[PDB]
């Protein structure tokens, strides 16, 4: 007898107003790192070789 996934989520994070707000705070924090890293990767790939970070090595040498 194993309950569905949304069922476990309801009981574990959504039912209590405290726990439901915690989940959104923590969720947003994880979502933020993953989304920015992913989107930045997509943007840089679409523009591979054109951005300063891509050609920078050619002019530095601190």
């Amino acid at each position: 007898v194993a309950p569905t996934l949304t069922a476990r989520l309801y009981s574990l994070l959504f039912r209590r107003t405290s726990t439901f707000a915690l989940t959104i705070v923590v969720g947003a924090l994880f979502f933020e790192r993953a989304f920015d890293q992913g989107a930045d990767a997509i943007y840089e790939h679409i523009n591979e070789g054109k951005l300063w970070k891509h050609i920078k090595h050619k002019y530095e040498n601190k």
């Binding site: 107003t17 405290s18 707000a21 915690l22 705070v25 923590v26 933020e32």
Partner: peptide, 22 residues
């Protein structure tokens, strides 16, 4: 009563909010 446990998750939310958001 349920206020401690609810005040403690409200506690946590603010904290994680600030921490992250700020």
């Amino acid at each position: 009563r349920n206020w401690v446990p609810t005040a403690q998750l409200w506690g946590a939310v603010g904290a994680v909010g600030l921490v992250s958001a700020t």
